[PDB]
Design a protein around this ligand. Structure first.
Ligand code: FES
Lengths: 116, 56
């Protein structure tokens, strides 16, 4: 068919053209970290938490908004992607209030779990 | 302890050791129950840079 071959951590998978990097990662079986992306809502690209490294690419792309093309090898657990996630969480938590004991979303917070 | 000399000699002879050298009752030689504040130094991963979590 028109399906194209993309690699996630060296594992090949067929994806329809127009599929984002995040959707390919879900197809392989991994969940890219996210804060602003919702499947039922339009793509925004604000939180930059879904930043993932494409092999042989010097710039980290946003997996939620970047359509994937043939031949890409998505390095989700690479050092660059981990450092990008750590930086994004540090910036997110720089101005967050210390309200966890009084917050109504204590044990079900995406911020808490993704920071952990 | 507050023991007379004769009783001390009797105990030392009967036991065969010098009791007053090493007594089993605690006296003023113990530390005070009020102590100065501590400081408790921080650990090795308290750097402000070159401390990314993915490396440790
Ligand atoms: S999930 Fe926020 S930038 Fe993609």
């Amino acid at each position: 068919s028109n399906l194209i071959e993309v690699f996630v951590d060296g594992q090949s998978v067929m994806v329809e053209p127009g599929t984002t990097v995040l959707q390919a990662c879900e197809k392989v079986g991994m969940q890219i970290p996210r804060f602003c992306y919702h499947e039922r809502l339009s793509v925004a690209g604000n939180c930059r938490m879904c930043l993932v490294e494409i092999e042989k690419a010097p710039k980290v792309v946003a997996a939620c908004a970047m359509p994937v093309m043939k031949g890409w090898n998505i390095l989700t657990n690479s050092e660059k992607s981990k450092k990008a996630r750590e930086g994004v969480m540090e910036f997110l938590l720089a101005n967050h209030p210390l309200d966890c004991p009084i917050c109504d979303q204590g044990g079900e917070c995406d911020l808490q779990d993704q920071s952990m | 302890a507050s023991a007379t000399r004769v009783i001390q000699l009797l105990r030392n002879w009967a036991s065969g050791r010098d009791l007053q050298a090493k007594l089993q009752l605690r006296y003023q030689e113990i530390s005070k129950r009020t102590q100065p504040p501590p400081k408790l130094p921080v650990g090795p991963s308290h750097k402000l840079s070159n401390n990314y979590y993915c490396t440790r």
